[PDB]
């Protein structure tokens, strides 16, 4: 009778099943999962209203959506600390420790392009910028915090740049029509198409790490929630999350099964 909801998609469905798995492994609490409940504003309201007890929320989403505060930095831990202190104060909400992966914008390149030019980080593109054949989503191309940021902070302009309906880009990168695209760092497609995901070595992109969000009065009543959920703190790399999202979205496995496998492989569950 602890209700854990997820926002829409495979990733939050994996996460809430992880929350269920650790809580049930370590306590006598019974967990009901509510996958695909709805979007951020709706799920946050359900938490505030006591309709659900826990959901996974992103650190950068807290600052921009709920606190309406600018992050002084792009350092992941400083952003989390800001989210957590703000939620505690302004919403009487407890935001527990975040997982490792940072689901933010990413640039990814074909493996062939990475191999020829030894590409590991965005800054490595400088000397090969005229070789880039980019296929960007319209949002990334046109938002001041997307391609414009690449131009300003990394000094990179790609003369060969197309805007593409998001789907077609992976076929185009597969076919060689493009060799670079934007995505979010945990998208299953990046694993599916075997792309090299570049390090944002200048921390241009703002951090979005997931962590459990609940009302403080909930933790007060069920203190035993804290230790289980915090077993996920600092766990799950971008690549591990990519692979799990792939298992659900492409291989058709259930979020519960891929969650349980990961936790077992990590020794978090026996």
PDB file of C-alpha atoms in Angstrom:
ATOM      1  CA  UNK A   1       0.000   0.000   0.000  1.00  0.00           C
ATOM      2  CA  UNK A   2       2.823   2.308  -0.982  1.00  0.00           C
ATOM      3  CA  UNK A   3       1.841   3.634  -4.412  1.00  0.00           C
ATOM      4  CA  UNK A   4       4.760   4.336  -6.789  1.00  0.00           C
ATOM      5  CA  UNK A   5       3.946   5.991 -10.110  1.00  0.00           C
ATOM      6  CA  UNK A   6       6.082   6.702 -13.184  1.00  0.00           C
ATOM      7  CA  UNK A   7       5.838   9.377 -15.814  1.00  0.00           C
ATOM      8  CA  UNK A   8       5.394   8.187 -19.362  1.00  0.00           C
ATOM      9  CA  UNK A   9       7.844   5.735 -20.926  1.00  0.00           C
ATOM     10  CA  UNK A  10      10.083   2.690 -20.564  1.00  0.00           C
ATOM     11  CA  UNK A  11      12.694   4.419 -18.379  1.00  0.00           C
ATOM     12  CA  UNK A  12      10.372   5.499 -15.520  1.00  0.00           C
ATOM     13  CA  UNK A  13       8.646   2.103 -15.727  1.00  0.00           C
ATOM     14  CA  UNK A  14      12.012   0.426 -15.179  1.00  0.00           C
ATOM     15  CA  UNK A  15      12.730   2.757 -12.261  1.00  0.00           C
ATOM     16  CA  UNK A  16       9.475   2.300 -10.377  1.00  0.00           C
ATOM     17  CA  UNK A  17       9.895  -1.465 -10.690  1.00  0.00           C
ATOM     18  CA  UNK A  18      13.357  -1.051  -9.162  1.00  0.00           C
ATOM     19  CA  UNK A  19      11.827   0.935  -6.325  1.00  0.00           C
ATOM     20  CA  UNK A  20       9.307  -1.893  -5.760  1.00  0.00           C
ATOM     21  CA  UNK A  21      12.038  -4.525  -5.884  1.00  0.00           C
ATOM     22  CA  UNK A  22      14.346  -2.922  -3.323  1.00  0.00           C
ATOM     23  CA  UNK A  23      11.535  -1.876  -0.948  1.00  0.00           C
ATOM     24  CA  UNK A  24      10.009  -5.394  -0.990  1.00  0.00           C
ATOM     25  CA  UNK A  25      13.421  -7.082  -0.636  1.00  0.00           C
ATOM     26  CA  UNK A  26      14.281  -5.079   2.483  1.00  0.00           C
ATOM     27  CA  UNK A  27      10.926  -4.376   4.192  1.00  0.00           C
ATOM     28  CA  UNK A  28       7.472  -5.782   4.747  1.00  0.00           C
ATOM     29  CA  UNK A  29       5.858  -2.892   2.869  1.00  0.00           C
ATOM     30  CA  UNK A  30       3.779  -3.826  -0.159  1.00  0.00           C
ATOM     31  CA  UNK A  31       4.272  -1.753  -3.277  1.00  0.00           C
ATOM     32  CA  UNK A  32       1.765  -1.033  -6.022  1.00  0.00           C
ATOM     33  CA  UNK A  33       3.320   0.321  -9.235  1.00  0.00           C
ATOM     34  CA  UNK A  34       1.440   2.723 -11.542  1.00  0.00           C
ATOM     35  CA  UNK A  35       3.394   2.876 -14.796  1.00  0.00           C
ATOM     36  CA  UNK A  36       2.782   5.536 -17.394  1.00  0.00           C
ATOM     37  CA  UNK A  37       0.635   7.611 -15.095  1.00  0.00           C
ATOM     38  CA  UNK A  38       1.064  10.862 -16.980  1.00  0.00           C
ATOM     39  CA  UNK A  39       3.305  13.827 -17.628  1.00  0.00           C
ATOM     40  CA  UNK A  40       5.363  15.799 -15.094  1.00  0.00           C
ATOM     41  CA  UNK A  41       2.756  18.359 -13.994  1.00  0.00           C
ATOM     42  CA  UNK A  42       0.058  15.696 -13.502  1.00  0.00           C
ATOM     43  CA  UNK A  43       2.275  13.261 -11.585  1.00  0.00           C
ATOM     44  CA  UNK A  44       3.704  16.001  -9.378  1.00  0.00           C
ATOM     45  CA  UNK A  45       0.175  17.114  -8.583  1.00  0.00           C
ATOM     46  CA  UNK A  46      -0.816  13.542  -7.730  1.00  0.00           C
ATOM     47  CA  UNK A  47       2.068  13.396  -5.255  1.00  0.00           C
ATOM     48  CA  UNK A  48       1.140  16.712  -3.676  1.00  0.00           C
ATOM     49  CA  UNK A  49      -2.475  15.557  -3.344  1.00  0.00           C
ATOM     50  CA  UNK A  50      -1.621  12.237  -1.741  1.00  0.00           C
ATOM     51  CA  UNK A  51      -2.931  10.260  -4.716  1.00  0.00           C
ATOM     52  CA  UNK A  52       0.476   8.522  -5.051  1.00  0.00           C
ATOM     53  CA  UNK A  53       3.296   8.120  -2.539  1.00  0.00           C
ATOM     54  CA  UNK A  54       6.527   8.150  -4.564  1.00  0.00           C
ATOM     55  CA  UNK A  55       7.648   8.846  -8.109  1.00  0.00           C
ATOM     56  CA  UNK A  56      11.038   9.271  -9.854  1.00  0.00           C
ATOM     57  CA  UNK A  57      11.845  12.898 -10.739  1.00  0.00           C
ATOM     58  CA  UNK A  58      14.781  14.589 -12.475  1.00  0.00           C
ATOM     59  CA  UNK A  59      17.035  17.118 -10.722  1.00  0.00           C
ATOM     60  CA  UNK A  60      17.016  19.731 -13.493  1.00  0.00           C
ATOM     61  CA  UNK A  61      13.234  19.284 -13.873  1.00  0.00           C
ATOM     62  CA  UNK A  62      12.796  20.208 -10.195  1.00  0.00           C
ATOM     63  CA  UNK A  63      14.640  23.499 -10.603  1.00  0.00           C
ATOM     64  CA  UNK A  64      12.905  24.605 -13.785  1.00  0.00           C
ATOM     65  CA  UNK A  65       9.391  23.277 -13.147  1.00  0.00           C
ATOM     66  CA  UNK A  66       8.676  23.296  -9.394  1.00  0.00           C
ATOM     67  CA  UNK A  67      11.177  25.708  -7.806  1.00  0.00           C
ATOM     68  CA  UNK A  68      11.423  28.027 -10.829  1.00  0.00           C
ATOM     69  CA  UNK A  69      15.024  28.759  -9.886  1.00  0.00           C
ATOM     70  CA  UNK A  70      18.070  29.045 -12.106  1.00  0.00           C
ATOM     71  CA  UNK A  71      20.877  26.601 -11.458  1.00  0.00           C
ATOM     72  CA  UNK A  72      24.031  28.559 -10.710  1.00  0.00           C
ATOM     73  CA  UNK A  73      25.989  25.672 -12.232  1.00  0.00           C
ATOM     74  CA  UNK A  74      25.834  22.545 -14.353  1.00  0.00           C
ATOM     75  CA  UNK A  75      27.553  20.442 -11.713  1.00  0.00           C
ATOM     76  CA  UNK A  76      25.260  17.436 -11.112  1.00  0.00           C
ATOM     77  CA  UNK A  77      25.751  17.286  -7.351  1.00  0.00           C
ATOM     78  CA  UNK A  78      25.258  21.028  -6.842  1.00  0.00           C
ATOM     79  CA  UNK A  79      22.036  20.863  -8.874  1.00  0.00           C
ATOM     80  CA  UNK A  80      20.756  17.919  -6.818  1.00  0.00           C
ATOM     81  CA  UNK A  81      21.540  19.699  -3.550  1.00  0.00           C
ATOM     82  CA  UNK A  82      19.621  22.706  -4.849  1.00  0.00           C
ATOM     83  CA  UNK A  83      16.635  20.555  -5.870  1.00  0.00           C
ATOM     84  CA  UNK A  84      16.545  18.653  -2.605  1.00  0.00           C
ATOM     85  CA  UNK A  85      16.865  21.682  -0.296  1.00  0.00           C
ATOM     86  CA  UNK A  86      14.217  23.524  -2.330  1.00  0.00           C
ATOM     87  CA  UNK A  87      11.721  20.689  -2.313  1.00  0.00           C
ATOM     88  CA  UNK A  88      12.143  20.238   1.432  1.00  0.00           C
ATOM     89  CA  UNK A  89      11.533  23.890   2.124  1.00  0.00           C
ATOM     90  CA  UNK A  90       8.961  24.952  -0.463  1.00  0.00           C
ATOM     91  CA  UNK A  91       6.981  21.729  -0.791  1.00  0.00           C
ATOM     92  CA  UNK A  92       7.687  19.759   2.386  1.00  0.00           C
ATOM     93  CA  UNK A  93       9.020  17.046   0.076  1.00  0.00           C
ATOM     94  CA  UNK A  94      11.922  14.664   0.559  1.00  0.00           C
ATOM     95  CA  UNK A  95      14.062  14.114  -2.502  1.00  0.00           C
ATOM     96  CA  UNK A  96      16.382  11.179  -1.856  1.00  0.00           C
ATOM     97  CA  UNK A  97      19.825  10.615  -3.357  1.00  0.00           C
ATOM     98  CA  UNK A  98      20.157  10.580  -7.116  1.00  0.00           C
ATOM     99  CA  UNK A  99      21.212   7.806  -9.461  1.00  0.00           C
ATOM    100  CA  UNK A 100      24.327   8.284 -11.600  1.00  0.00           C
ATOM    101  CA  UNK A 101      23.026   8.597 -15.140  1.00  0.00           C
ATOM    102  CA  UNK A 102      22.447  12.052 -16.507  1.00  0.00           C
ATOM    103  CA  UNK A 103      19.652  12.035 -19.050  1.00  0.00           C
ATOM    104  CA  UNK A 104      20.394  15.211 -20.933  1.00  0.00           C
ATOM    105  CA  UNK A 105      21.134  16.178 -24.512  1.00  0.00           C
ATOM    106  CA  UNK A 106      23.908  14.233 -26.210  1.00  0.00           C
ATOM    107  CA  UNK A 107      25.775  14.149 -29.487  1.00  0.00           C
ATOM    108  CA  UNK A 108      26.385  10.741 -30.958  1.00  0.00           C
ATOM    109  CA  UNK A 109      28.298   9.735 -34.051  1.00  0.00           C
ATOM    110  CA  UNK A 110      28.488   6.697 -36.331  1.00  0.00           C
ATOM    111  CA  UNK A 111      31.024   4.142 -35.138  1.00  0.00           C
ATOM    112  CA  UNK A 112      32.896   4.508 -38.448  1.00  0.00           C
ATOM    113  CA  UNK A 113      33.363   8.273 -37.907  1.00  0.00           C
ATOM    114  CA  UNK A 114      34.483   7.729 -34.307  1.00  0.00           C
ATOM    115  CA  UNK A 115      37.060   5.155 -35.401  1.00  0.00           C
ATOM    116  CA  UNK A 116      38.575   7.180 -38.217  1.00  0.00           C
ATOM    117  CA  UNK A 117      39.062  10.251 -36.012  1.00  0.00           C
ATOM    118  CA  UNK A 118      39.390   8.802 -32.504  1.00  0.00           C
ATOM    119  CA  UNK A 119      36.320  10.631 -31.250  1.00  0.00           C
ATOM    120  CA  UNK A 120      35.482  10.459 -27.526  1.00  0.00           C
ATOM    121  CA  UNK A 121      34.279  13.954 -26.572  1.00  0.00           C
ATOM    122  CA  UNK A 122      32.420  16.825 -28.254  1.00  0.00           C
ATOM    123  CA  UNK A 123      35.594  18.931 -28.278  1.00  0.00           C
ATOM    124  CA  UNK A 124      37.257  16.255 -30.464  1.00  0.00           C
ATOM    125  CA  UNK A 125      34.974  17.379 -33.305  1.00  0.00           C
ATOM    126  CA  UNK A 126      36.818  20.683 -33.756  1.00  0.00           C
ATOM    127  CA  UNK A 127      39.552  19.426 -36.099  1.00  0.00           C
ATOM    128  CA  UNK A 128      37.051  17.357 -38.107  1.00  0.00           C
ATOM    129  CA  UNK A 129      34.118  19.775 -38.168  1.00  0.00           C
ATOM    130  CA  UNK A 130      34.071  19.971 -41.972  1.00  0.00           C
ATOM    131  CA  UNK A 131      33.604  16.184 -42.069  1.00  0.00           C
ATOM    132  CA  UNK A 132      30.483  16.298 -39.908  1.00  0.00           C
ATOM    133  CA  UNK A 133      27.238  15.496 -41.667  1.00  0.00           C
ATOM    134  CA  UNK A 134      24.715  16.402 -38.959  1.00  0.00           C
ATOM    135  CA  UNK A 135      21.084  15.393 -38.653  1.00  0.00           C
ATOM    136  CA  UNK A 136      19.474  17.347 -35.856  1.00  0.00           C
ATOM    137  CA  UNK A 137      16.006  17.366 -34.386  1.00  0.00           C
ATOM    138  CA  UNK A 138      14.316  20.706 -34.999  1.00  0.00           C
ATOM    139  CA  UNK A 139      14.299  21.446 -31.277  1.00  0.00           C
ATOM    140  CA  UNK A 140      18.017  20.858 -30.879  1.00  0.00           C
ATOM    141  CA  UNK A 141      18.793  22.835 -34.001  1.00  0.00           C
ATOM    142  CA  UNK A 142      16.720  25.875 -33.019  1.00  0.00           C
ATOM    143  CA  UNK A 143      16.723  26.089 -29.200  1.00  0.00           C
ATOM    144  CA  UNK A 144      19.193  28.515 -27.660  1.00  0.00           C
ATOM    145  CA  UNK A 145      20.466  25.687 -25.386  1.00  0.00           C
ATOM    146  CA  UNK A 146      20.992  23.174 -28.220  1.00  0.00           C
ATOM    147  CA  UNK A 147      23.080  23.627 -31.367  1.00  0.00           C
ATOM    148  CA  UNK A 148      23.583  27.318 -30.544  1.00  0.00           C
ATOM    149  CA  UNK A 149      25.276  26.186 -27.330  1.00  0.00           C
ATOM    150  CA  UNK A 150      27.593  23.921 -29.340  1.00  0.00           C
ATOM    151  CA  UNK A 151      28.493  26.902 -31.522  1.00  0.00           C
ATOM    152  CA  UNK A 152      29.128  29.242 -28.593  1.00  0.00           C
ATOM    153  CA  UNK A 153      30.734  27.002 -25.969  1.00  0.00           C
ATOM    154  CA  UNK A 154      32.601  24.513 -28.191  1.00  0.00           C
ATOM    155  CA  UNK A 155      33.151  26.854 -31.144  1.00  0.00           C
ATOM    156  CA  UNK A 156      31.704  24.288 -33.540  1.00  0.00           C
ATOM    157  CA  UNK A 157      29.676  25.083 -36.641  1.00  0.00           C
ATOM    158  CA  UNK A 158      28.711  22.313 -39.048  1.00  0.00           C
ATOM    159  CA  UNK A 159      28.322  23.522 -42.633  1.00  0.00           C
ATOM    160  CA  UNK A 160      26.637  20.229 -43.504  1.00  0.00           C
ATOM    161  CA  UNK A 161      23.514  20.138 -41.369  1.00  0.00           C
ATOM    162  CA  UNK A 162      20.020  18.851 -42.102  1.00  0.00           C
ATOM    163  CA  UNK A 163      16.899  18.927 -40.006  1.00  0.00           C
ATOM    164  CA  UNK A 164      15.095  15.608 -40.075  1.00  0.00           C
ATOM    165  CA  UNK A 165      11.976  14.004 -38.741  1.00  0.00           C
ATOM    166  CA  UNK A 166      13.517  12.404 -35.628  1.00  0.00           C
ATOM    167  CA  UNK A 167      12.932   8.790 -36.698  1.00  0.00           C
ATOM    168  CA  UNK A 168      14.533   9.017 -40.122  1.00  0.00           C
ATOM    169  CA  UNK A 169      17.837  10.154 -38.595  1.00  0.00           C
ATOM    170  CA  UNK A 170      18.755   6.747 -37.259  1.00  0.00           C
ATOM    171  CA  UNK A 171      18.173   5.200 -40.668  1.00  0.00           C
ATOM    172  CA  UNK A 172      20.228   8.033 -42.155  1.00  0.00           C
ATOM    173  CA  UNK A 173      23.069   7.468 -39.695  1.00  0.00           C
ATOM    174  CA  UNK A 174      22.779   3.748 -40.381  1.00  0.00           C
ATOM    175  CA  UNK A 175      22.858   4.418 -44.132  1.00  0.00           C
ATOM    176  CA  UNK A 176      25.627   7.047 -43.922  1.00  0.00           C
ATOM    177  CA  UNK A 177      23.584  10.029 -45.114  1.00  0.00           C
ATOM    178  CA  UNK A 178      24.589  11.619 -41.776  1.00  0.00           C
ATOM    179  CA  UNK A 179      27.364  10.765 -39.268  1.00  0.00           C
ATOM    180  CA  UNK A 180      26.261  12.829 -36.256  1.00  0.00           C
ATOM    181  CA  UNK A 181      22.942  13.351 -34.483  1.00  0.00           C
ATOM    182  CA  UNK A 182      21.523  14.738 -31.262  1.00  0.00           C
ATOM    183  CA  UNK A 183      19.612  12.576 -28.802  1.00  0.00           C
ATOM    184  CA  UNK A 184      19.068  12.267 -25.087  1.00  0.00           C
ATOM    185  CA  UNK A 185      21.867  10.317 -23.415  1.00  0.00           C
ATOM    186  CA  UNK A 186      19.705   7.363 -22.310  1.00  0.00           C
ATOM    187  CA  UNK A 187      17.726   6.828 -25.563  1.00  0.00           C
ATOM    188  CA  UNK A 188      17.548   3.140 -26.527  1.00  0.00           C
ATOM    189  CA  UNK A 189      18.190   4.019 -30.191  1.00  0.00           C
ATOM    190  CA  UNK A 190      21.793   4.931 -29.301  1.00  0.00           C
ATOM    191  CA  UNK A 191      22.395   1.374 -28.146  1.00  0.00           C
ATOM    192  CA  UNK A 192      20.335  -0.063 -31.004  1.00  0.00           C
ATOM    193  CA  UNK A 193      22.344   1.679 -33.717  1.00  0.00           C
ATOM    194  CA  UNK A 194      25.665   1.130 -31.929  1.00  0.00           C
ATOM    195  CA  UNK A 195      26.517   4.837 -31.932  1.00  0.00           C
ATOM    196  CA  UNK A 196      29.443   6.401 -30.100  1.00  0.00           C
ATOM    197  CA  UNK A 197      27.992   8.783 -27.535  1.00  0.00           C
ATOM    198  CA  UNK A 198      30.369  11.700 -27.034  1.00  0.00           C
ATOM    199  CA  UNK A 199      31.313  13.116 -23.642  1.00  0.00           C
ATOM    200  CA  UNK A 200      30.022  16.636 -22.997  1.00  0.00           C
ATOM    201  CA  UNK A 201      33.455  17.549 -21.715  1.00  0.00           C
ATOM    202  CA  UNK A 202      32.624  21.238 -21.265  1.00  0.00           C
ATOM    203  CA  UNK A 203      29.399  20.529 -19.340  1.00  0.00           C
ATOM    204  CA  UNK A 204      27.349  22.587 -21.794  1.00  0.00           C
ATOM    205  CA  UNK A 205      24.176  20.581 -21.154  1.00  0.00           C
ATOM    206  CA  UNK A 206      22.243  20.922 -17.881  1.00  0.00           C
ATOM    207  CA  UNK A 207      22.106  17.869 -15.590  1.00  0.00           C
ATOM    208  CA  UNK A 208      19.014  15.661 -15.167  1.00  0.00           C
ATOM    209  CA  UNK A 209      19.543  12.870 -12.714  1.00  0.00           C
ATOM    210  CA  UNK A 210      16.666  10.809 -11.390  1.00  0.00           C
ATOM    211  CA  UNK A 211      15.864  10.411  -7.702  1.00  0.00           C
ATOM    212  CA  UNK A 212      12.880   9.352  -5.573  1.00  0.00           C
ATOM    213  CA  UNK A 213      10.459  12.106  -4.685  1.00  0.00           C
ATOM    214  CA  UNK A 214       7.887  11.832  -1.882  1.00  0.00           C
ATOM    215  CA  UNK A 215       6.155  14.002   0.723  1.00  0.00           C
ATOM    216  CA  UNK A 216       8.253  14.297   3.882  1.00  0.00           C
ATOM    217  CA  UNK A 217       5.217  13.244   5.930  1.00  0.00           C
ATOM    218  CA  UNK A 218       5.319   9.970   3.972  1.00  0.00           C
ATOM    219  CA  UNK A 219       8.911   9.277   4.946  1.00  0.00           C
ATOM    220  CA  UNK A 220       8.034  10.262   8.523  1.00  0.00           C
ATOM    221  CA  UNK A 221       5.358   7.573   8.546  1.00  0.00           C
ATOM    222  CA  UNK A 222       7.426   4.947   6.697  1.00  0.00           C
ATOM    223  CA  UNK A 223      11.061   5.653   7.636  1.00  0.00           C
ATOM    224  CA  UNK A 224      11.982   2.199   6.309  1.00  0.00           C
ATOM    225  CA  UNK A 225      11.595   3.564   2.769  1.00  0.00           C
ATOM    226  CA  UNK A 226      14.833   5.495   2.918  1.00  0.00           C
ATOM    227  CA  UNK A 227      17.544   2.834   3.104  1.00  0.00           C
ATOM    228  CA  UNK A 228      16.129   0.664   0.274  1.00  0.00           C
ATOM    229  CA  UNK A 229      15.647   3.548  -2.153  1.00  0.00           C
ATOM    230  CA  UNK A 230      19.098   4.910  -1.355  1.00  0.00           C
ATOM    231  CA  UNK A 231      20.689   1.619  -2.503  1.00  0.00           C
ATOM    232  CA  UNK A 232      20.209   3.042  -5.981  1.00  0.00           C
ATOM    233  CA  UNK A 233      22.166   6.200  -5.102  1.00  0.00           C
ATOM    234  CA  UNK A 234      25.063   6.742  -7.473  1.00  0.00           C
ATOM    235  CA  UNK A 235      24.048   3.661  -9.442  1.00  0.00           C
ATOM    236  CA  UNK A 236      23.125   3.141 -13.114  1.00  0.00           C
ATOM    237  CA  UNK A 237      25.473   4.685 -15.676  1.00  0.00           C
ATOM    238  CA  UNK A 238      24.236   6.339 -18.865  1.00  0.00           C
ATOM    239  CA  UNK A 239      25.242   3.226 -20.767  1.00  0.00           C
ATOM    240  CA  UNK A 240      23.553   0.832 -18.342  1.00  0.00           C
ATOM    241  CA  UNK A 241      20.332   2.855 -18.639  1.00  0.00           C
ATOM    242  CA  UNK A 242      20.611   2.833 -22.446  1.00  0.00           C
ATOM    243  CA  UNK A 243      20.938  -0.941 -22.437  1.00  0.00           C
ATOM    244  CA  UNK A 244      17.931  -1.403 -20.133  1.00  0.00           C
ATOM    245  CA  UNK A 245      15.758   1.000 -22.139  1.00  0.00           C
ATOM    246  CA  UNK A 246      16.771  -1.101 -25.176  1.00  0.00           C
ATOM    247  CA  UNK A 247      15.682  -4.328 -23.518  1.00  0.00           C
ATOM    248  CA  UNK A 248      12.194  -2.928 -23.011  1.00  0.00           C
ATOM    249  CA  UNK A 249      11.752  -0.851 -26.167  1.00  0.00           C
ATOM    250  CA  UNK A 250      13.448  -3.184 -28.680  1.00  0.00           C
ATOM    251  CA  UNK A 251      13.743  -6.712 -27.248  1.00  0.00           C
ATOM    252  CA  UNK A 252      10.260  -6.510 -25.756  1.00  0.00           C
ATOM    253  CA  UNK A 253      11.200  -7.553 -22.219  1.00  0.00           C
ATOM    254  CA  UNK A 254       9.093  -6.362 -19.286  1.00  0.00           C
ATOM    255  CA  UNK A 255      10.307  -3.406 -17.236  1.00  0.00           C
ATOM    256  CA  UNK A 256      10.004  -5.617 -14.166  1.00  0.00           C
ATOM    257  CA  UNK A 257      12.305  -8.292 -15.551  1.00  0.00           C
ATOM    258  CA  UNK A 258      15.012  -5.921 -16.837  1.00  0.00           C
ATOM    259  CA  UNK A 259      14.914  -4.111 -13.450  1.00  0.00           C
ATOM    260  CA  UNK A 260      15.219  -7.320 -11.476  1.00  0.00           C
ATOM    261  CA  UNK A 261      18.097  -8.511 -13.677  1.00  0.00           C
ATOM    262  CA  UNK A 262      20.018  -5.312 -13.162  1.00  0.00           C
ATOM    263  CA  UNK A 263      19.529  -5.289  -9.422  1.00  0.00           C
ATOM    264  CA  UNK A 264      20.607  -8.930  -9.209  1.00  0.00           C
ATOM    265  CA  UNK A 265      23.634  -8.401 -11.408  1.00  0.00           C
ATOM    266  CA  UNK A 266      24.613  -5.515  -9.108  1.00  0.00           C
ATOM    267  CA  UNK A 267      24.096  -7.566  -5.952  1.00  0.00           C
ATOM    268  CA  UNK A 268      21.533  -5.062  -4.727  1.00  0.00           C
ATOM    269  CA  UNK A 269      19.019  -7.936  -4.655  1.00  0.00           C
ATOM    270  CA  UNK A 270      19.876 -11.591  -4.015  1.00  0.00           C
TER     271      UNK A 270
END
